[PDB]
């Protein structure tokens, strides 16, 4: 017997440490590795797992040509051992999907899988391996979700979903799902948040989600949610913004609305509230998906004249490609440990990655209440060595 | 301790949703994938699995040349994770077989495996990994079975078997098997059914099988069976027929006999009775194994002047190759969820598939009581990219 | 908790049926498959497994050249799913070995692994994954063992071992081993048996072993053994002999001594006593390792003028290569089911197998109390398709 | 429920026997095998495992060029079945690491993983799959650890760590870690030990570590440790030294200080105290990493005029390459069995290994209280057959 996962507080932490790294592109030089993008990490009672949206092709084969394309019927959510490269011998196929979320409720895995035509997609809800429910696109405009783990509290899982324009007002919802059955949804209040996609969520008593505003916000929207309702919304106050693109530091302190500067498009990213402070992941570049650093901003969660970057860990150099990043948690004794992954995108459309495909590798970090050292953990592939 | 699977009713449903897709041909471009055909899906308490008849060769190797051939000693029933491509690193070999059925009784797996000479074949019964019984060909003419999951109720499994001509009167039997031991068989009554092969079965209190008449019927034969006997037989009443080949819609309402129009040969297919209505899978083409759609026919299960196609979901476009299809069930709370798979055949003898081999990929769908969206989930391989 | 395996009687049977087939050479065309020889099968409570002596090389690679050689330091006993081809992604390495035996006692696996110099070999005893004991060569002349499963009764396993000349008087021993610890050994009486190697054993209340006389016997030596001592020895009475080479049928009824005709060398083979009758596997050829058939000889176990071949099943045609064969058992309700495997050798030194390597595939059969059909299940590889 | 591993005595033994061998380089001829170095073995309740530091590349691919390099961000500790070659289909990634140790406490696995810049590395402590603690480099000079299994007693694991110069005075510490939490550390006394790296440890009531002095000692430093403190330190008294390089036999009896002859650099090696005697592994060459033998020195653990090599087993000939070696233990009834592995390095910088990469295979041996035979179990690869 296993109890449902509980609403624990986040563990104390003061820095992030290298965890798992898959080196998937390097290891894919001989065409063994499945083409992927939009990876994430989620854990059950026994194991942490890598998930990603596969492209139904092996890296460097003719079918991998043109995999920059976001949505095809040949994309599936796949799962593979954390820190391993995805190969035909080690992967599991979870569901057909070109957008997804996964989370473990303490007893079973739930997954949310979107597929189908852009104007008539549906999300399949999978629970314990069985398709238990679905969501039909209601705005008929690329129904889509987190691309990282959802969160479950006392048996009820919450997941954020969007349907509507990429660069104009869209519909944003939170769905509450219990043992695979949709219990209710709420439209996210638009009093503060103006655009929301690709939420990265974690648990700190309540569920906290830090997301992507693809329209007018260079600052990230956020929500605080419990097993019943949305409790609070906003944008991260930090005058040091963390979307890409974004303005140079420092920019506007915008707690209650999108910055309206360098607002579109964006990249999936994450953060962790820590008291009144906030930790924010971001690309090193303000314009491109290169480099990765995590900053701690003093009083960055609140409206304050005192924001300062008290810590910056540079984890992937700006000479290296990054991509999406997202939060995941690991249960400690009586708290959840904050961790994250970084997607390291190689191939199109990255300048000088002269191959026809698009894929990624993964690196991950976890928070501890200790001082970290320093290093650089980029993809590491010599693109000139790769089959094109 | 695990109880035997019970005679539950079918869950309510109003449409079908994309579940798992293996993209096996696409992923086999570099010769990693085992050549297969006649795939199906069946689930135990912990996992749903892909099964297929392998050809004892890897796709695109010299030994894959000529795998259009149906029966060889080098064919085995293999099992692999659902939605994954079959590779040497992930498959299990169940038994030697060029025709098969598999089902889980709640405690253990049973399999039925036919192999040997066309005029002296035998079916091996495997239960919990052990060969427990057998059936010797009695008509000496290609003893053969479902090519999809059998069904087990209260510990007794039922499976349909045929021996005799492909295009004339043959012998059709149902076998009842308990913990791997044959308990009894019955010759299927020939009062209505005139030819029967490749039954696709599910449980809705009783076992229902919808099969292939390869001789005179463009409509599909069916049986209703319990743990003791055959209860009822017929052909699906729907004036919209679902074998391939078949006449244009609408054709004859033939509840009690083969249509006698476009009667031979056929393709394995499936259906689900829903009250007085019926859902029927079929190729989009009336002549060839291209496309796949599922239709709901109002009052299509009964003798009625009111048959109408109330729903048509097009799941594989007529510009894409399909093949066999079959039912499987997944246990919900107190009902069984209806699901199906579609075999997507590539290679010989498909026009313009210029390769020497014959194989397939798989796509699957499950029924929910929700409205579906729409899409297209074909094999997706560019045959020109493949080793020949 | 699992009890030790008990001394059950052999199940009734009247014919043998195709079980698992790995098609390993066919599937090794693209160099994925590990080079092996001397395979066998043994089962635990949950699974039957293939075992074989690997050669530390992949089929068709440069390191596979010259693998006809019997003993090297690069040979290991490996285990892989029954009926699958051995690949790097699915195998387990059990121990370093150029001769081996394995058996499951109901709780744990025991293995016997010989390796080292021809004149100073040692056998390592492995139990539950731990090296628990050893046997040092005492005749300093290729200490060697069964190359098929040993047998365990009430927690005590018995295994036959030989040290000494291949074609002159040698030493033959049975070792009794309990939870991996050698309890005792006995020198096999030489009152009847004059040479003994490669015993194929099964349980029918007591352990019965049918072996290979490599010196003067075209008939096979046998032993009956319990958990404490050797009870009986002899040669199989059947005037239809079953070693290879051997005389044409009928030859001598030699219950108590080697035939002294076509006596050397031999091939590993097996048999099953059934009342006063005996079932014997053999190559179809009297001179070479081609073809495979199993015969039932009426009163073939005893001294009788009435020996007749009442049944012959031809399982591999004489146009196809065979090799070693051995018995294994599978627990039924209150009896053990007799099964066997046949090694299908391809490569050197087989005439017209124009490759530099030597390897094998496997086919298996089990006994049932039903009448079998007929067929042919040879290796199936086109040697001209293979990397050399 | 599983109890913590207990402080058992070492089993009696009088020789070492071949256990598992992976033949990884031979099997990597077709580019399937992951590039590794610094392998070791460690066991849990169910299985013994191979561990190694991967290089994030497949053997013989372009990314394998230059893998002689010791520390990169693309190195991970990986785990794979003992005696198998590491491939993408069978490996697990444990953590990012260019130096590591692993051990099982009876309930869960602990790992110590160093990565990052040479002057700012950190060690991540992993327990039951979760990152639980860390150690920050304090001398800022290649924080590093055992490269073989640590040892755990009554739930407290001990591991030796070094930070500082390779060929001058450095800092050496033992860390005590319980359920992944650092409890305390001690600086190793420098009264006797002058330089210490790469400890090979085992349990004989207390933990004993035999290490590498890379500075002035051709004799090996050692420590005796319990769950609370360092109890004793020294250098192995044996006048037959066992580092590489080292002087010809016999050299100095140096129980309390480095020999000061042929003192730098060294190789990781191991030993086992047996009463007043000692068993020591060593390369056959006094200058290079070729060959492997294990010697027993009478009274070699103590200060005595009576040291004599009473036994020498030659396990890898001096015509073959060796490398690192280390101890591991396997639980017997009421004692621990002493075992070891030998790393067989192929590629750069080995003379005449004309390839651009550096990797290894593994061979292992276990101690029994029986007399061994003899043999030779080298890597076995023909380097001329390998992709460069
Ligand atoms: C939602 O969960 C609560 C229990 O969690 C608490 O309340 C949440 C809203 C959130 O604040 C958490 O951090 C809290 O820990 C459930 O409330 C329980 O309901 C049962 C049945 O009525 C009752 O017996 C318990 O006493 C309640 N516990 C508390 C503290 O009120 C509630 O049922 C959950 N709601 C749903 C829709 O499942
Ligand atoms: C990646 O693919 C492109 C496009 O391939 C072409 O169109 C595809 C849909 C498919 O039908 C292919 O068979 C076609 O070749 C390749 O670009 C083409 O290259 C060919 C050959 O040099 C050239 O004749 C065409 O003009 C190109 N077409 C376009 C649209 O630019 C490209 O070469 C592939 N990249 C690699 C590394 O193979
Ligand atoms: C077959 O199953 C029945 C139980 O299932 C019921 O009857 C079936 C024929 C079918 O109608 C199902 O939908 C029903 O749920 C077994 O009948 C039981 O037998 C035992 C022993 O005699 C008796 O104690 C129970 O009361 C019976 N149950 C009922 C409802 O009659 C029957 O034994 C099964 N037959 C075989 C051959 O196994
Ligand atoms: C697929 O195989 C056919 C047939 O192969 C021939 O017969 C087989 C049984 C086997 O013995 C092969 O070695 C033979 O080559 C191939 O068709 C043959 O092609 C060859 C070479 O071009 C030609 O000489 C023959 O006339 C052809 N034979 C027939 C019956 O048509 C065919 O090329 C193979 N396809 C591919 C893609 O390799
Ligand atoms: C060997 O096994 C017997 C039990 O098996 C029986 O005797 C064998 C020799 C063989 O004939 C089998 O087919 C039989 O089933 C053990 O005998 C038992 O010993 C215990 C302890 O003394 C005693 O309590 C039981 O009554 C005995 N059983 C019988 C039937 O005698 C014997 O201990 C085993 N010997 C060894 C060395 O383990
Ligand atoms: C299989 O190997 C043989 C022998 O290979 C030679 O000796 C080996 C031990 C190793 O050192 C190899 O590098 C050697 O080439 C091959 O037979 C040799 O072939 C070569 C090249 O044609 C020729 O020069 C030699 O005379 C041959 N030597 C002998 C002893 O006959 C053989 O070609 C290999 N087979 C295949 C299919 O590659
Ligand atoms: C360390 O372990 C001891 C138990 O192990 C014994 O003492 C070790 C130092 C070493 O000598 C081993 O070989 C011995 O077997 C723990 O001592 C126990 O502590 C508890 C709580 O106080 C007490 O109830 C027991 O009686 C103690 N046992 C003995 C024999 O003294 C000790 O707690 C461990 N220390 C740590 C830090 O965990
Ligand atoms: C192993 O790699 C070396 C070095 O490769 C060069 O530098 C690397 C960092 C990378 O940028 C490669 O693309 C470079 O080629 C190879 O040595 C070089 O070989 C090339 C081609 O012959 C030659 O032009 C250079 O002078 C060489 N450079 C050096 C530093 O010596 C070497 O060939 C590779 N080995 C193998 C077996 O491929
Ligand atoms: C369409 O672009 C959206 C997503 O963008 C990106 C990215 O690399 O920026 C990857 C996704 N790829 C997939 N998840 N497959 C997209 N999301 C989808 C649904 O296409 C964006 O958020 C605007 O709506
Ligand atoms: C012989 O043809 C039968 C089966 O047909 C087909 C198909 O693609 O139409 C595949 C099978 N392939 C295998 N199951 N291997 C055949 N069935 C067999 C037993 O050959 C048909 O149903 C008439 O009897
Ligand atoms: C040496 O020949 C013996 C074994 O023979 C054969 C065979 O194919 O005939 C395979 C073995 N191969 C291995 N088990 N590796 C040999 N047995 C050994 C130990 O070499 C024979 O039984 C005479 O003693
Ligand atoms: C730097 O050299 C150290 C280690 O040396 C060696 C070896 O082959 O001699 C392998 C290691 N490789 C790795 N563990 N990766 C090194 N150790 C490290 C940390 O580099 C040496 O002990 C001196 O400090
Ligand atoms: Ca390959
Ligand atoms: Ca933005
Ligand atoms: Ca028909
Ligand atoms: Ca003979
Ligand atoms: Ca030294």
Burial bucket for residue A138 (CB in 10 Å: 0-12, 13-18, 19+):
exposed
Choose the catalytic residue: A70, A154, A206, A276.
A70
Closest chain B C-alpha to C23 CA, distance in angstroms: 6
Q: Is the dihedral of CA B2, B4, B7, B13 positive or negative?
A: positive
Query: Can you tell me the distance from the alpha carbon of A307 to that of A295, in angstroms, rounded to the nearest whole number?
Result: 12
**Closest-CA residue in chain A for B367?**
A131
A359-to-A24, A344, B11, C303, D258 alpha-carbon distances in Å: 9, 8, 40, 74, 53
CA of B325 to the centre of ligand 10 (A): 13
- For residue D256, report the distance from its CA to the centre of ligand 7, in Å: 29
Interchain pair B89, C85: CB under 8 A: no
Nearest to B348 by CA among B388, B299, B291, B306: B388
Neighbour count for residue B349 (Cβ, 10 Å): 8
Beta bridge partners of A95: A77
Handedness of CA B127, B129, B132, B138 (dihedral sign): positive
What is the distance between the alpha carbons of residues A196 and A214, in angstroms, rounded to a whole number? 7
d(CA D378, CA B347) in angstroms, rounded, equals: 47
Q: Which residues in chain D are closer than 8 Å to A371, comparing Cβ atoms?
A: 136
Facing B62 at nearest CB: one of C29, C48, C377:
C29
Residue with tokens 């050893």: C134
User: Rounded to an integer, what distance in angstroms lies between the CA atom of residue B201 and that of residue B223?
Assistant: 9
Q: Which of B20, B23, B331 sits opposite A74 (nearest CB)?
A: B23
Helices (H) and strands (E) in chain B, counts: 1, 24
Cα angle value C295/C298/C302 (rounded, 5°): 110
Structural domain boundaries enclosing A345:
1-388
Q: Is C156 in the pocket of ligand 11 (CB under 6 A)?
A: no
Tell me which residues have their CB closer than 6 angstroms to ligand 12.
Answer: D 38, 53, 70-71, 98-99, 142, 144, 147, 166, 197-198, 214
Tell me how far apart the alpha carbons of residues D265 and C243 are, in angstroms, rounded to a whole number.
61
For chain D, what is the largest distance between any 2 Cα atoms, rounded to a whole number of angstroms?
55
The two beta strands, A308-321 and A290-298, are antiparallel
| Closest residue to B17, CB basis, from A87, A89, A122 | A122
Look at phi and psi of residue A103 and say left if phi exceeds 0, alpha if psi is from -120 to 50, else beta. Answer: beta
Q: Which residues fall within 8 angstroms of residue C49, CB to CB, at 6 or more apart?
A: C41, C42, C43, C79, C80, C81, C82
Cα of D267 to nearest chain A Cα, Å? 27
Q: Which tokens is A332 given?
A: 């400690």
> At D332, phi and psi to the nearest 5?
-100, -150
Cβ(B236)–Cβ(B177) under 8 Å? no
Going by C-alpha positions, the residue among B253, B175, B258, B155 that lies closest to residue B214 is B258
**Cα angle vertex B60, ends B56, B66, to 5°?**
60
- Maximum Cα–Cα distance across chain B: 55
Q: How far apart are CA D16 and CA D336, in angstroms?
A: 14
Which residues are registered as beta bridge partners of B185? Answer: B175
Pull the structure tokens for residue D194.
């002058």
* CA D99/CA D90 separation, integer angstroms: 22
Closest residue of chain C to B118, computed from CA coordinates: C375
Catalytic residue among B141, B324, B353, B379: B324
Is the separation of the CB atoms in B58 and B34 below 8 Å?
A: yes
Q: Identify the residue among A29, A76, A96 best suited for mutation to test binding to B, counting B beta carbons within 10 A and taking the highest.
A: A96
Q: Using CB atoms, which residue from C19, C27, C43 is nearest to B95?
A: C19
CA C124 to chain centroid, in Å, comes to 19
Write b or e for each residue in B195-216: b if 16 or more Cβ atoms lie within 10 A of its Cβ, otherwise e: bbbbbbbbbbebbbbbbbbbbb
Q: What residues are in contact with ligand 3 under a 6 Å CB criterion?
A: B 7, 154, 156, 205, 226-228
CB hemisphere CA count around C145 (13 angstroms) = 33
Burial class (CB in 10 A: 0-12, 13-18, 19+), B134: buried
Q: Which residues contact D333 (CB under 8 A, 6 or more apart)?
A: none
Instruction: Report the distance separating Cα C317 and Cα C304, nearest Å.
Output: 31
> Closest by alpha carbon to D18, among D313, D385, D225?
D313
User: What gap in Å lies between CA A212 and CA A193, rounded to an integer?
Assistant: 10
Judged by its nearest atom, the ligand closest to the C-alpha of residue B158 is: 3
| C178 Cα nearest atom in ligand 5 | 38
Ligand closest to Cα of C214 equals 16
CB contacts < 8 A, A to B, total: 129
Query: Does the annotation count B324 as an active-site position?
Result: yes
**Active-site residue, D249 included:** no
- Pairing between β-strand A109-115 and β-strand A122-127 as defined by DSSP bridges: antiparallel
Query: Which ligand has the shortest distance to the CA of B245?
Result: 15
Look at residue B18 and give its three-state secondary structure.
Answer: strand
Q: Within 13 Å and on the Cβ side, how many CA atoms surround B270?
A: 28
Question: Beta partners for A60?
Answer: none
> Three-state DSSP class for C26?
helix
Q: Quick one: three-class SS letters along chain A?
A: CCCCCCCCCECCCCEEEEEEECCHHHHCCCCCEEEEEEEEEEECCCCEEEEEEEEEEECCCHHHCCCCCCCCCCCEEEEEECCCCCECCCCEEEEECCEEEEEECCCCEEEEEEECCCCCCEEEEEECCEEEEEEECCCCCCCECCCCCCEEECCEEEEEEEECCCCCCCEEEEEEEECCEEEEEEECCCCCCCCCEEEEEEEECEEEEEEECCCCCCCCEEEEECCCCEEEEEECCCCCCCCCCCCCCCCCCCCCCCCCCCCCCCCCCCEEEECCEEEEEECCCCCCCEEEEEEEEECCCCCCCCCEEEEEEEEEEEEEECCCEEEEEEECCCCEEEEEEEEEEEECCCCCCCCCCEEEEEEEEEEECCCCCCCCCCCCCCHHHCCC
Ligand 7 atom with least separation from CA of D176: 37
Residues 6+ apart with CB under 8 A from C69: none
- Buried-state track D229-243, b at ≥16 Cβ within 10 A, e below 16: ebeebbbbbbbbbbb
Q: Is A198 annotated as a binding residue?
A: yes
In 3D, which of B216, B363, B340 has the Cα closest to residue B279?
Answer: B340
- CA of C205, closest atom in ligand 5: 13
Under 8 Å between Cβ of C39 and C365 = no
CB B263 within 8 A of CB B256: no
| Nearest beta carbon to residue C84 from set B91, B134, B136 | B91
State how far the Cα of A287 lies from the Cα of C227, in Å rounded to an integer. 78
After which residues does chain C become discontinuous at a C–N distance over 2.5 Å? Answer: none
Give C141 to chain B, closest Cα distance, Å.
39
Given CA atoms A302, A308, A309, A311 in this order, what sign does their dihedral have? negative
Say if residues D322 and D289 touch (Cβ distance below 8 Å): yes
Report the DSSP pairing between strands B151-153 and B156-163: antiparallel
Q: Do residues C260 and C328 touch, judged by C-beta distance below 8 A?
A: no
Q: Are D124 and D137 in contact (CB under 8 A)?
A: no
The answer to whether A131 contacts B337, with C-beta atoms less than 8 Å apart, is yes
| Residue where the block lists tokens 């890379």 | D214
Q: How far is the CA of D160 from the centre of ligand 16 (A)?
A: 60
Question: For residue B268, which of B339, B344, B324, B195 has the smallest C-alpha distance?
Answer: B324
Q: In what order do the strands lie in the sheet with D221-225?
A: D197-204, D206-212, D221-225, D230-235
Helix (H) or strand (E) holding B346: strand B336-347
Task: For an interface test with C, give the residue of D23, D33, D371 to mutate (most C CBs within 10 A).
Answer: D23
Q: Is B148 in the pocket of ligand 10 (CB under 6 A)?
A: no
Rounded CA separation A90/C312 (Å): 45
Q: How was this structure determined?
A: X-ray
Q: Rounded to whole angstroms, how far apart are CA atoms C183 and A129?
A: 50
* Contact pairs from chain A to chain D, CB under 8 Å: 129
Residue partners of C333: CB distance under 8 A and separation at least 6:
none
- Give the three-state DSSP class for D109: strand
D386: CB partners within 8 A, 6+ apart:
D25, D28, D29, D59, D60, D355
Those residues with Cβ within 8 angstroms of residue B153's Cβ, 6 or more apart along the chain or in another chain: B4, B5, B6, B7, B203, B207, B226, B227
- Among C18, C22, C27, the residue with its CB nearest the CB of B116 is C18
H helix or E strand, kind and range, residue C123: strand C122-127
| Those residues with Cβ within 8 angstroms of residue D147's Cβ, 6 or more apart along the chain or in another chain | D38, D40, D53, D99, D100, D101, D198, D268, D324, D326
Task: Round to whole Å and give the CA distance between D328 and D204.
Answer: 12
Dihedral-angle region of residue A50 (phi above 0 means left; psi in -120 to 50 means alpha; beta otherwise): beta
The 3-state DSSP class for residue B385 equals helix
Best residue of B56, B112, B138, B140 to probe chain C, by most C CBs closer than 10 Å: B56
Question: Pairing mode, if any, of strands C197-204 and C181-187?
Answer: unpaired
Q: What's the structural domain count of chain A? A: 1
Residue given tokens 């078949």 in the structure block: B246
Say whether D23 and C96 touch across the interface (CB within 8 A): no
Cβ partners under 8 Å of residue B59, min gap 6: B25, B28, B31, B32, B33, B34, B35, B357, B359, B386, B387
Check residue C86 and report its DSSP letter: P
**What is the DSSP-derived secondary structure letter of residue C105?**
-
Place of tokens 């939420």: A199
Q: Binding site for substrate, residues of D?
A: 37, 71, 197-198, 212, 289
Q: Please give the full DSSP string across B256-267, using - where no structure is assigned.
A: SS---SS-S---
Please, which residues have CB within 8 angstroms of residue D153's CB and are 6 or more apart in sequence? D4, D5, D6, D7, D203, D207, D226, D227
Cα–Cα distance for residue pair A347/A335, rounded to 1 Å? 39
- Asked if residues B320 and B378 have their Cβ atoms less than 8 Å apart, the reply is yes
> What Cα–Cα distance (Å) separates residue D242 from each residue in D113, D144, D216?
27, 22, 14
Tell me which of D91, D202, D324, D341 is the catalytic residue.
D324
Q: Smallest CA–CA separation between A20 and chain B, in Å?
A: 24
Q: Is D29–C62 a contact, with Cβ atoms under 8 angstroms apart?
A: yes
Q: Taking the mean position of all CA atoms in its chain, how far away is CA B379? A: 18
Q: Which single residue is written with the structure tokens 């409570």?
A: C45
**Closest ligand to C38 CA?**
11
Contact D74/A21, CB-based, under 8 Å?
Answer: yes
Distance CA B49, CA D63 (A): 37
Q: How far is B133 from chain C (nearest CA, A)?
A: 7
The answer to whether A83 is a known ligand-binding residue is no
In this complex, do B23 and A57 lie within 8 Å of one another by their Cβ atoms?
Answer: yes
Q: Is residue D197 classed exposed, middle or buried when 0-12, 13-18 and 19+ CB atoms within 10 A define those classes? A: buried
Q: Give C63's contacts in chain D (Cβ within 8 Å).
A: 26-27, 29, 381-382, 385
- CB–CB contact B124 C33 (8 Å): no
* CA distance readout (Å), C125 to A94, C110, C209, D316: 43, 7, 20, 22
Q: Is the dihedral of CA C85, C88, C89, C91 positive or negative?
A: positive
Exposed, middle or buried: residue B265 (CB in 10 Å: 0-12, 13-18, 19+)? Answer: middle
Extract the tokens encoding C114: 């010989």
Measured CA distances, A217 to A244, A276, A303, A307, C218 (Å) = 10, 22, 17, 19, 88
Residue of B380, B370, B312 whose CA lies nearest to B346: B380
Enumerate helices (H) and strands (E) in chain C, giving the number of each. 1, 24
Q: Is C334 annotated as ligand-binding? A: no
Q: Which chains touch C (3 or more CB pairs under 8 A)?
A: B, D
Please check whether residue C106 is in contact with residue C153, taking contact to mean a CB–CB distance below 8 angstroms. no
User: Cis omega before residue D349 (within 30°)?
Assistant: yes
Using the 8-state DSSP alphabet, how is residue B44 labeled?
A: -
Q: Which among A141, A324, A353, A379 is annotated as catalytic?
A: A324
**Which residues are CB-contacts of A129 (< 8 A; sequence separation ≥ 6)?**
A109, B43, B46, B47, B48
- Tell me the CATH number at D386: 2.120.10.10
């Amino acid at each position: 017997f296993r109890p449902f996962k509980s609403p624990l507080p986040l563990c104390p932490f003061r820095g992030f440490f290298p965890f798992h790294k898959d080196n998937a592109i390097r290891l894919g030089e001989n065409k063994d590795v499945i083409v992927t993008r939009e990876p994430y990490v989620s854990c059950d009672n026994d194991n942490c797992w890598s998930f990603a949206l596969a492209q139904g092709a092996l890296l460097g084969t003719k079918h991998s040509n043109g995999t920059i394309k976001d949505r095809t019927p040949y994309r599936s959510l796949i799962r593979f051992p954390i820190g391993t490269a995805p190969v035909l011998g080690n992967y599991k196929e979870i569901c057909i999907a070109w957008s997804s979320s996964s989370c473990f409720d303490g007893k079973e895995w739930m997954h949310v899988c979107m597929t189908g035509n852009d104007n008539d997609a549906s999300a399949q809800i999978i629970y314990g391996g069985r398709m238990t429910d679905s969501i039909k696109s209601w705005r008929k405009d690329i129904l889509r979700t987190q691309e990282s783990e959802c969160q479950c509290i006392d048996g009820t899982c919450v997941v954020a979903v969007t349907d509507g324009p990429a660069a104009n007002s869209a519909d944003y919802r939170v769905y509450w799902i219990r043992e695979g059955k949709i219990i209710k949804y709420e439209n996210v209040p638009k009093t503060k948040i103006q655009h929301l996609e690709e939420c990265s969520c974690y648990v700190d008593i309540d569920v906290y989600c830090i997301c992507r505003d693809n329209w007018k916000g260079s600052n990230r929207p956020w929500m605080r949610i419990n097993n019943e309702t949305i409790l609070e919304t906003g944008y991260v106050c930090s005058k040091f913004h963390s979307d890409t693109p974004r303005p140079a530091d420092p920019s506007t302190m915008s707690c209650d609305s999108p910055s309206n500067v360098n607002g579109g498009p964006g990249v999936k990213g994450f953060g962790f509230k820590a008291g009144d402070d906030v930790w924010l992941g971001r690309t090193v570049s303000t314009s491109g998906r290169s480099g990765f650093e995590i900053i701690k901003v003093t009083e960055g969660w609140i409206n304050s004249p005192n924001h300062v970057k008290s810590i910056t860990q540079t984890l992937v150099s700006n000479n290296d490609w990054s991509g999406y990043s997202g939060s995941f948690i690991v249960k400690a004794k009586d708290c959840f440990q904050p961790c994250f992954y970084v997607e390291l995108i190689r191939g199109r459309p990255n300048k000088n990655d002269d191959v026809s495909w698009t894929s990624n590798s993964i690196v991950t970090f976890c928070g501890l209440d200790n001082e970290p050292g320093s290093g650089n953990w980029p993809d590491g592939s010599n693109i000139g060595f790769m089959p094109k």
